[PDB]
Symmetry: C2
């Protein structure tokens, strides 16, 4: 593969200097149209051989283009904040917003390449990292990103003449082969000649940029639930107390330091999600948990890919994050109301699975709740809530809108559990016509999941 860019690629001064006058003006214009459209981000990965012009070329691009609209990152030295969270988290944090450009040195490729070359991970684990990168980039691109990957190359003999290489290019070749895609190709740019390497990257950027700017029943599950299940006065008191003490104990366990906890709550309107969350929080000191109620995305969230808004709330080791509503919004209300396109929610299922697998692989304990009531129970709770003198309990116009689409929600939850209840992250369906049963089942599920993790730790 690499021998194409070992053929001595070169550009003379006169040709290059004329090229550059027009290239830099054309980039500034495109960069400005990128800002004005505010429609998609540009991500440039900078990898390859040390001394093949990586840093020099990025410097030159910030002289040709406007650095006020470009952020350059390296991920050499992670902070404790970054290290105490899943490895993908640090990249999400620095993704450039729509209309801006982010240049990443020291990205996910450098990490996986030097880890294999330095021998800290096996062949199998590199293949996993290659396939994770492809799914990550496909999502970023599916979300609208314009993604450029540049590999700056010297040959073994070219490198030596500039006053680990072998296995580095051996493994590099495998990665590049398996992550060069029509939607996000690798551009191998020979770095021997500094005019060629800079003009070639400039031109590929301009081309790709100009081009991007010129563009425009499933009821089985829920029907099978025994919603008649309940706990009586004594069962509730005792079991609530036992499982609350059990939760406080598990989190207080030293082994919780190697883990964290994410609990997702979804369910029908008036199913009792808030009260179920409160019986969990009742077990703990509030410095032990972070509740995120998920609403319509804010401006800054809308400027980023879908999952950015959730990754930003992922807990550090020893923390507990509760999502009241979650990333499943996309396969629920967004699907039903048309806040995203069908192709968007269809790909979400696998993107969500990929997300939860990232979390799980790092040691985050993921539990997911769908609190299910029948339609008649919803109507009764809606009635009860209306006749209280509490403004918080008012049934809104949106509440009635959602209830009207009851059957669309049944089908959507069916599809969701079919496509995202995984071995790594199962869906727990909570029978919730009786709040007492629902509240204890939530606590017991969290606790079993934590115990399960401590056992798996060996």
């Amino acid at each position: 593969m690499f021998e194409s860019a070992e053929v001595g690629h070169s550009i003379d001064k006169d040709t290059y200097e004329k090229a550059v006058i027009e290239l830099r003006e054309a980039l500034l214009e495109a960069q400005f149209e990128l800002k004005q459209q505010a429609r998609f981000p540009v991500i440039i990965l900078i990898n390859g051989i040390e001394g093949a012009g990586k840093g020099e070329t990025v410097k030159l691009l910030n002289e040709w283009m406007d650095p006020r609209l470009i952020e350059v990152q390296s991920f050499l030295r992670p902070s404790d904040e970054e290290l105490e969270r899943p490895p993908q988290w640090r990249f999400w944090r620095r993704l450039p917003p729509k209309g801006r450009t982010g240049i990443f040195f020291g990205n996910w490729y450098s990490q996986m390449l030097y880890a294999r070359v330095e021998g800290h991970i096996k062949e199998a684990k590199l293949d996993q990292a290659i396939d994770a990168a492809e799914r990550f980039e496909r999502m970023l691109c599916d979300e609208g990103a314009l993604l450029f990957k540049f590999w700056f190359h010297l040959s073994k003999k070219q490198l030596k003449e500039r006053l680990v290489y072998d296995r580095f290019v051996h493994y590099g070749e495998r990665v590049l082969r398996r992550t060069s895609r029509d939607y996000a190709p690798w551009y191998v740019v020979e770095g021997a000649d500094e005019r060629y390497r800079a003009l070639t990257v400039g031109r590929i950027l301009l081309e790709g940029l100009q081009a991007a700017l010129a563009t425009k029943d499933n009821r089985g599950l829920l029907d099978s639930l025994d919603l008649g299940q309940y706990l009586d006065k004594d069962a509730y008191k005792e079991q609530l107390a036992a499982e609350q003490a059990r939760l406080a104990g598990l989190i207080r366990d030293k082994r919780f330091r190697q883990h964290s906890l994410v609990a997702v709550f979804e369910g029908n309107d008036a199913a009792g999600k808030g009260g179920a969350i409160r019986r969990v929080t009742d077990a703990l000191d509030p410095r032990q948990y972070h509740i995120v109620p998920i609403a319509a995305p804010t401006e800054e969230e809308r400027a980023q890919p879908y999952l950015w808004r959730f990754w930003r709330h992922i807990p550090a080791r020893r923390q507990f994050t509760i999502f009241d509503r979650s990333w499943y919004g996309r396969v629920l209300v967004e699907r039903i109301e048309g806040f995203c396109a069908p192709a968007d929610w269809l790909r979400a299922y696998g993107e969500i699975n990929d997300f939860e697998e990232q979390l799980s692989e790092y040691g985050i304990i993921v539990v997911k709740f769908w609190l299910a009531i029948d339609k008649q129970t919803q109507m009764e709770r809606f009635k009860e809530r209306e006749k209280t003198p509490y403004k918080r309990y008012k049934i809104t116009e949106e509440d009635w809108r959602n209830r009207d689409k009851w059957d669309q929600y049944v089908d959507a939850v069916g599809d969701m559990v079919d496509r995202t209840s995984t071995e790594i992250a199962p869906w727990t369906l909570v029978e919730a016509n009786d709040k007492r049963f629902a509240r204890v089942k939530v606590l017991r599920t969290i606790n079993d999941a934590i115990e399960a993790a401590y056992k798996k730790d060996k």
Copy 2:
């Protein structure tokens, strides 16, 4: 001062339980209306004696109220990100947005009291911390925050009968804590943000008392010639093409070397750029960046605030961009917008910009004190040169230049910027952070002066360091 809350306040079980039923419903309703209005934040500070029911009480509030709408923080285990930035940054980072509540343990008071009681800081530095708190709280409340401060108390005798870094078993610990607590509380209890001293010996009294204070406070809140500095510039100054290229080259090398110097590890750099439209800020900024690798700097072009910035007090948007140690942040437009464009267009009230000068100075002092090098440029051009530049922009086919609908209007507001730049310079050109007026009619002169100033400021800083 604490003797009021040493008399032994109690509430009986039955009176308590009755009151709580009502109180929790009224709290929940107040919390919901707060979310609905989305107009201001609620901040609750939790402080006082070990064993006085601080944590117990905050837990109970999260049973009474909806915890989904409350963030509970503590600040005495800073991360790398927090430790490499000025001490105040970490609090700004966790402020709750409008319509939410944040409850702070280990806040700025715990920090200053612990530091003094342990002998880490001297009397003068405690007094400074006290005043910084008063000023910080004032600004937050001026911006709209509802700020509660609770001091949970026990007497020495009550403590005696009853994880903090202080050893409360030592008699001296309590005595000194309460001695300094008195001085802190007297100085920082204000009509717009009182301290509430709550006796903590009785669980029922302490929880109910705090909850009642919160309800009351929340219900109430839910119901509601400086032109001679510019006229005296000599805008006739310039640099010849040859003098420019040598000097530009010399100053770029000097900057690269100063940034690479080991002494920069103790520091960071902030460069602020303001000036007339078409004054050439972009160009000056790029001749600085041309000197360095892009991994060495971060440029922030300041525009209209985003949604998440609008939900927070004014300086929050700027604090979020302050550099860690060894970093260099360039602000293309800055927090000075408040006393420039906002003042002029009326995007904020006269009270808001008048208080901004002191606020800005306090901000810049916080940065200086941590070792951040702050450089501030006003690029000055005349009306005649502006117009030449407005024509040259549009003369060119390139549509990034086209002079927009608005900055033909701003040009008819020229003497309003003169008056405003004058006031700004008078009120915020301090010993700690002076303003540099750049005579900018000649781009070449302007560019070299910007670079030279940055370089003079870094060298100066090194000369001040040990």
